[PDB]
Design a protein around this ligand. Structure first.
Ligand SMILES: [Mg+2]
Ligand SMILES: [Mg+2]
Ligand SMILES: [Mg+2]
Ligand SMILES: [Mg+2]
Ligand SMILES: [Mg+2]
Ligand SMILES: [Mg+2]
Ligand SMILES: [Mg+2]
Ligand SMILES: [Mg+2]
Ligand SMILES: [Mg+2]
Ligand SMILES: [Mg+2]
Ligand SMILES: [Mg+2]
Ligand SMILES: [Mg+2]
Ligand SMILES: [Mg+2]
Ligand SMILES: [Mg+2]
Ligand SMILES: [Mg+2]
Ligand SMILES: [Mg+2]
Ligand SMILES: [Mg+2]
Ligand SMILES: [Mg+2]
Ligand SMILES: [Mg+2]
Ligand SMILES: [Mg+2]
Ligand SMILES: [Mg+2]
Ligand SMILES: [Mg+2]
Ligand SMILES: [Mg+2]
Ligand SMILES: [Mg+2]
Ligand SMILES: [Mg+2]
Ligand SMILES: [Mg+2]
Ligand SMILES: [Mg+2]
Ligand SMILES: [Mg+2]
Ligand SMILES: [Mg+2]
Ligand SMILES: [Mg+2]
Ligand SMILES: [Mg+2]
Ligand SMILES: [Mg+2]
Ligand SMILES: [Mg+2]
Ligand SMILES: [Mg+2]
Ligand SMILES: [Mg+2]
Ligand SMILES: [Mg+2]
Ligand SMILES: [Mg+2]
Ligand SMILES: [Mg+2]
Ligand SMILES: [Mg+2]
Ligand SMILES: [Mg+2]
Lengths: 95, 85, 122, 93
RNA sequence: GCUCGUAGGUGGUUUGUCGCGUUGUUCGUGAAAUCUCACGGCUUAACUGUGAGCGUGCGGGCGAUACGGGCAGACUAGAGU
RNA sequence: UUCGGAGAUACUCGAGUGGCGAACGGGUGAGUAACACGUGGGUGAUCUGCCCUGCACUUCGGGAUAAGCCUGGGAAACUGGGUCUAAUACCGGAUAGGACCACGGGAUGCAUGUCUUGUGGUGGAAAGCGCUUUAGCGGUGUGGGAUGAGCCCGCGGCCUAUCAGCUUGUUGGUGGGGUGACGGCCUACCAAGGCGACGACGGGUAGCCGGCCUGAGAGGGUGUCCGGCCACACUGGGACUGAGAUACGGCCCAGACUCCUACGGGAGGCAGCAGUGGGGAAUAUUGCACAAUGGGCGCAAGCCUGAUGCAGCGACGCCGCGUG
């Protein structure tokens, strides 16, 4: 007879997305963008630094992007079969 | 089968499937009827049948024949369907 | 009616799927094999790795024919295929089971095992 | 349901026991959510210990202990101090 | 056999910046059991329990920029005209 | 009261209806080179029965049916017909915000978006069962936890180029459908993209792991007891109920194998605990207890538990001790 009828939600910090940066190579597939990621990691036994790349897909709510386009991205819920990323901000446009 | 409970359990399963069948036949025929109403764009019978359609859909949700998430999915679906009629 | 140089499909599981009638046993110059007549045959093709190998001279009994056969009661029996089952010299099938319907004429020719394991006898 | 059950980790001739919180639909020697005590029934009185401040947390959130653990829970007194009984004090020796 | 050259690997001197590699610290995780240290008890042992390491790795924050890397430049010593 | 039957009223309770459980639990490693596994993250894109907590409600009714009884058919397996009866089984209602739509506020961002609200118009829930006279078990609508789970992703982890072109629902988008949920998961249309020499596609092999063996370490071999994860359950394909399904001892179908038939038809799945046969050089008792713990159910006592505790056999291995 005395309770608040709504126990408030326990304050939980918002889990953040993961952001990275890469170029673009291909653009003519209709609001989809392809960012070619980069990563360097210590070779497990010979101990060298190996340069390994990626080729991954990110969203464009507006289909404007040249070739190059150092841009940044963070994860999302899948919007296609192999869609996992979203473009966030475009910097140093394709020159 | 073998277990004394298993025969009884199947005897309940047939009851469940049949009484469920009545319900999903009802709601399928009714969503088809609503599509008949909306495609014609009468907007009078289409306006007044919602009082029956969401009524039986929520009846289905309460009795658990289907689940409330897809229930909401369908009701939003036809709500936005008439929202452009 | 089955005669020499007639191919019959095999209605058993010995491995042979088609045999070629060599002789119609049951007398000199006997021409046709009806339902329940015993045939010596050569296996013209068999399943790979099967028990009964291609080019094997075997004994078989005709169990279904596409030519209609009279029963004494004036009825007739007709199948869509000519089929025989490979048998041992004691009239028991070489295989372990019979596929497809079987003419009842094998009952009074003492192919009782074949009758027993046939899916259904007409 | 989340259970506070008595999980067996002993030898043939010694039944040492170690108390945690785990889901009911789980085997004994499985993954326990968190370890909160131990129980060795071989000494003269006993060997008993419960954390006594996560046990309150689990009992408050709804981790129901089993029938051998409920007795031990009255013994450590957490049951009485969780149910508001006048015997809130622990009574072990 | 020799050369050219693709990917790749690797790269002179110097300025400023980023801090990805690298590196420092903390937090979280790295289950339990296993292995190591110390005790305790099964007559000792094998075995067990408890406390401390291990869990080399990864994620977040706060530092650094010597070296490597990105960027914006500069030099002429390498290279070419 | 016959001397061996009646008397449900009556504790007690066979057969019967309903709920929960049966998805936990145990086994095997065939398949699988894969987000299957190890490690770390995202879910503003999600589900989660019974457990805990905060708040309102239990309000009117109806109609069937099992079981039972009388009977029919069939070899049985099983099944048809006719009366009759209930319930926390089923159906109809009234009110109820955590459905929806639209229009708005107020907070925060990481974009689709998130929460708290208001207005209006629509909507959906339940139940009773016992009492030595302060024995008690319930149910329903929801907010939040706890737990379990689902999905997605970075990194890591075999051989092989005497496998170089693979991909068409493939790559993306829109509108839909579908899902618990995002998603070509599916579909209509449109464009022609995606993966790959950092090894695509293919071939071979293989359950993976904490670990175990070895080694000074790095490495090499291996994945057996235990424990975690996955996959499977005679072979292959599919749905159902239910919160929850590779649904080992559930269902549907096809296939192979063994059995009964009165030949029309049916039943079975030890990689559960044993144990049998067969292969091998070779690995065991058709035992006891629910005493303990974990689990299932019931207000409870209590019943079930080949999980579990044990016990028997094999020097099979380690340790200890004797045969002075
Ligand atoms: Mg889209
Ligand atoms: Mg039952
Ligand atoms: Mg209909
Ligand atoms: Mg939808
Ligand atoms: Mg040169
Ligand atoms: Mg060169
Ligand atoms: Mg080059
Ligand atoms: Mg370079
Ligand atoms: Mg340099
Ligand atoms: Mg000692
Ligand atoms: Mg010691
Ligand atoms: Mg130890
Ligand atoms: Mg550890
Ligand atoms: Mg010069
Ligand atoms: Mg009874
Ligand atoms: Mg089962
Ligand atoms: Mg199971
Ligand atoms: Mg095996
Ligand atoms: Mg009645
Ligand atoms: Mg009602
Ligand atoms: Mg209403
Ligand atoms: Mg109940
Ligand atoms: Mg298409
Ligand atoms: Mg679409
Ligand atoms: Mg859609
Ligand atoms: Mg294999
Ligand atoms: Mg060495
Ligand atoms: Mg394993
Ligand atoms: Mg094994
Ligand atoms: Mg088998
Ligand atoms: Mg369901
Ligand atoms: Mg079975
Ligand atoms: Mg066994
Ligand atoms: Mg042998
Ligand atoms: Mg027990
Ligand atoms: Mg118990
Ligand atoms: Mg033993
Ligand atoms: Mg010994
Ligand atoms: Mg020996
Ligand atoms: Mg020794």
């Amino acid at each position: 007879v005395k309770g608040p009828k709504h126990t408030p939600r326990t304050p939980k910090p918002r889990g953040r997305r993961k952001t990275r940066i890469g170029y673009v190579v291909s653009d003519k597939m209709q609001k989809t963008i392809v960012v070619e990621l980069e990563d360097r990691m210590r070779h497990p036994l010979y101990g060298k630094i190996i340069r390994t790349t990626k080729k991954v897909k990110a969203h464009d709510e507006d289909s404007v992007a040249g070739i190059g386009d150092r841009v940044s991205l963070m994860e999302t819920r899948p919007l296609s079969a192999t869609k996992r990323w979203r473009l966030v901000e475009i910097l140093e446009k394709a020159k | 089968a073998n277990i004394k409970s298993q025969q009884k359990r199947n005897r309940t399963n047939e009851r469940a499937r049949l009484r469920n069948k009545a319900v999903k036949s009802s709601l399928r025929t009714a969503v088809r009827a609503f599509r008949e109403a909306a495609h014609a764009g009468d907007k009078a019978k289409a306006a007044e049948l919602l009082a029956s359609t969401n009524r039986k859909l929520d009846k289905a949700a309460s009795k658990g024949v289907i689940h409330k998430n897809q229930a909401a999915n369908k009701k939003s679906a036809l709500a936005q369907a008439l929202n452009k009629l | 009616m089955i005669q020499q140089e007639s191919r019959l499909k095999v209605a058993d599981n010995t491995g042979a799927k088609e045999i070629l009638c060599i002789r119609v046993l049951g007398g000199s110059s006997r021409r046709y094999a009806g339902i329940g007549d015993v045939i010596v045959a050569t296996v013209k093709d068999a399943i790979p790795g099967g028990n009964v190998k291609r080019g094997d001279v075997v004994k078989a009994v005709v169990v279904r024919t596409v030519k209609e056969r009279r029963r004494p009661d004036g009825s007739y029996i007709k199948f869509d295929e000519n089929a025989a089952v490979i048998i041992k010299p004691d009239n028991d099938p070489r295989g372990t089971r019979i596929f497809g319907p079987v003419g009842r004429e094998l009952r009074e020719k003492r192919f009782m095992k074949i009758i027993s394991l046939a899916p259904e006898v007409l | 349901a989340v259970k506070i059950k008595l999980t067996r980790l002993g030898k043939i001739r010694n039944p040492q026991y170690r108390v945690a919180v785990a889901d009911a639909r789980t085997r004994r020697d499985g993954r326990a959510i968190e370890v909160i005590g131990r129980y060795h029934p071989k000494e003269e009185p006993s060997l008993i210990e419960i954390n006594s401040e996560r046990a309150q947390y689990w009992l408050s959130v709804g981790a129901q202990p089993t029938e051998p653990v409920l007795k031990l829970l009255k013994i450590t007194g957490d049951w009485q101090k969780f149910k508001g009984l006048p015997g809130a004090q622990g009574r072990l020796k």
